[PDB]
Symmetry: D2
Subunit: 288 residues, 4 copies
């Protein structure tokens, strides 16, 4: 049931105007750029990289609508819809279903130290809202205890973004019928090696070509290319994040003529020249 | 040498009453304030902080809580409102409202969830400072003693709420910034804070055991060093027993047991069976609060 | 040219009698077992797994001699020779050279919080003792760059990499293609391979080199599905193995296979006879038969 | 209650003198002991611990240091010997020697390097206890308060050397085990230790600043709350300044500056240029130790 979840899913940036309003036309331009230029397999919206905590409830609903409309069914869509507002999350779940999202995800309840029982109840509540597949976020206790969340109605698997590749291996061993979307960009080839087939990541927003190169080399059994292309990709990631990640991704999109707008406060707003030069540097070095 | 008089003593981090169904329980806010001032005999109240479930409040809910507290207090004790969130524009409006309502200070949590840089954190506090002329308490951010000073020197910042378990860093801040106010926010180390010069204490546990905490302060002031030890052991036994169940649920249950319409927590905090949390409230009350 | 460093290097256990004496004959039996039964590519001696801090200076020398004698030049030999005793360490480096070990290694100065300068100076002192390749231990706390200051010390050919940080490993492999990284996290063998590790040091290969080699062969044969499956089995084995003390289990498993592998030294827990035997039979039956 | 009066006060964790070329400097051990007793005026001495470079001592060196200290001290102050290591049979011989030499207590570090289980650690202390009838101080092991009590109950164990930065765990131990002796070993938190009932202090920094540490204790006993704060800020300034170069190198240099043949550290500790470390010693001495 998971072929549509194979490949690269950029964690989409959410365009804001300079004065911090949701930039609706920009959302459409980003979706078109991801689908048409980056040639991605799917889009992961309103996650951390989408600045989701800086979005109003109305903004979230609007992004979900704009993305579904611009996509027009071309690629797989997953919406991250979690927050501490459980009623809003349920409403966004229903909206995702209505808009024909392929799946939803929800972050672990954040800020406070929520118990396992509270986390389990949270996912249970969201599950009763709409019959749409859910990816839970990986929560570092036991492999077995994590399985209790994976068994929740409508949960098809997890978005796995931890650096612990042993925990990842143990999950792949224990739950071969669950879907693990691998969310640590710098370890793409290591994820492939242990059976990941779908990848969500911020860095795929502007370098799906470089990431796809790793996947293609891996599938072709070119061991040395897998290594080389990984070192290059990870050079890129570290260069990219020498300035704010979302500001950099957005600036690179703008450099390519995409109306991707700006980050919202309290993210740092860079001087014009500084961030443009950063985007130029990254594009020249990695993105041709 | 005796600065910040109005900030001395105990400041419960006030719980925010909700109905069973999750609505802001406005009458409950007033009851809680009256219980804290009149029964707990507190020196001040710290509102819409973590213990006040502030991330579960709407913007309008926050304004309402700030108004209801100022109204119920009617100037009796010192008021501090935690007003920070990732919504900077809303935070500025709350700063202005705090000022209009004659709050004695505001505070604002460190920008959370994401890993914000020092510069982003510094800029966040700078923006909040321009909104209103009202003293600000920043949250301690563990960044050397010196680098933290760059945050302390922001316009209108008078000091910091210090909630870390690092007592050496606290001692270092007290040495380096004798002109700034440090409100000590680790309830389990009250006496340690006092030892190194803390005079004001913000904490969730003072909502229902101000007497036990004050007993430590009074012993300390009275030079009763053995009682400081004994009363601390009792107090920390209390803290550990209290948090055997969810903190805010337990605080609210103890208030409800004392006839205070303190309501319930909001989702996603665990909702206990009413009999289970009642026994917990009685357990804490009979053991420590008589 | 690091061809002789390719493959599996068990971190050899050091046999002691029940009374805590070095069991000389057992040292040779363990070497023969690793070479002939486990079919290993090399042996890594007097490391953590070999209870090296429980060995006297004279014991360390004797193990070094016994292993070189038992090996009879068959497999690659690496001796971990580090301790806080620098003069002894220097003497062990000279001995390893005299015995024609292929490399030495030395753990980071331990117990105390030593500075980078102290750690650098420690490796410099050892380096001057004897002309033999040195593998330094990876230290996290430390940038990929400043770890390069350790890697460039005289006679240092690379590092034994035992951290769980696969990104730092990838970065080292990127930056130092000239250096040798021996990958020492048994539970991530296939991940190591993926990023270019070719030599593996670990405690678990003492008794399941076959299981580990199966992963390597599947990887080399492009059987990506088997790499996954054999890894899942291998990691099941690792976790089952360490449900009792690691060295007690490895030694009990060897004893079950007729190898005079002896016992651990204090303060390691001494199990009751039946408990550890049952554990060894369980591991053998489930994974090693 | 036990009479633990001889364990009150300051116990420097004595440095072990070595010659420049790394030999045990036997005459230096006696001079350091006299300096501690006669000039620092300490209440006791804690030998062959981390600060004494014990891991860099041979078994024979350890026995020699123990003999030389007991000789030089001639019963003037309380003596405690740290005798632990991974060599259990050697540790037992050292426990027997400590008793023969009339040491007041012994201590033994937690088995180190490897991750030893609770059971292994328990059995280790059990084995040491059978060797000689002499009081033992176990090292605090960060573990529940109740689980640590199982170690405290071992034959001949009278308490623990508490060196962690966790003052809450310390408070919990003091609450649960009022008849066990806890020697407080975090120099930067002396006054916080006193406040929770510590009466005996083991620390590297008392080797050369017993005066500054005693000033804190005397101020605390005198209920001079402000002086406790001020003297603590000064003391902790001193500690941070002291360790801006290697701790043992600095302590030894300060002693040498005071005409004490304290010698040098052993490898792999950094050897400073003599002028560099001398100026460091003068800087500390002139700023803090006159
Ligand atoms: Cl994301
Ligand atoms: Cl920007
Ligand atoms: Cl709070
Ligand atoms: Cl409840
Ligand atoms: Cl090892
Ligand atoms: Cl055993
Ligand atoms: Cl010490
Ligand atoms: Cl020196």
């Amino acid at each position: 049931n998971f072929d549509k979840f194979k490949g690269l899913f950029p964690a989409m940036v959410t365009p804001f105007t300079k004065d911090g309003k949701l930039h609706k036309a920009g959302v459409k331009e980003v979706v078109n750029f991801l689908v048409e230029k980056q040639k991605v397999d799917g889009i992961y919206i309103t996650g951390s990289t989408g600045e989701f905590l800086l979005l109003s409830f109305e903004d979230k609903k609007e992004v979900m609508k704009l993305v579904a409309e611009a996509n027009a069914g071309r690629v797989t869509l997953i919406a991250q819809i979690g927050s501490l507002n459980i009623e809003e999350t349920k409403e966004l779940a229903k909206l995702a279903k209505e808009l024909k999202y392929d799946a939803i995800s929800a972050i672990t309840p954040y800020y406070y130290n929520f118990s396992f029982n509270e986390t389990h109840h949270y996912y249970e509540e969201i599950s009763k809202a709409a019959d749409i597949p859910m990816l839970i976020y990986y929560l570092p206790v036991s492999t077995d205890q994590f399985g209790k969340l994976l068994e929740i109605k409508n949960v098809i698997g997890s978005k796995y973004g931890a650096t612990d590749l042993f925990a990842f291996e143990r999950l792949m061993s224990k739950y071969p019928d669950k879907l693990f979307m691998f969310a640590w960009d710098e370890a793409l080839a290591m994820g492939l090696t242990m059976g990941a087939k779908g990848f969500i990541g911020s860095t795929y927003n502007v370098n799906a070509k470089g990431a796809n190169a790793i996947i293609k080399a891996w599938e072709a059994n070119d061991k040395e290319a897998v290594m080389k292309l990984t070192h290059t990709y990870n050079d890129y990631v570290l260069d990219l994040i020498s300035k704010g990640l979302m500001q950099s991704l957005k600036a690179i999109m703008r450099l390519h003529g995409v109306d991707a707008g700006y980050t919202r406060k309290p993210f740092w707003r860079y001087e014009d020249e500084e961030i443009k030069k950063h985007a130029e540097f990254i594009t020249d070095k990695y993105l041709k």
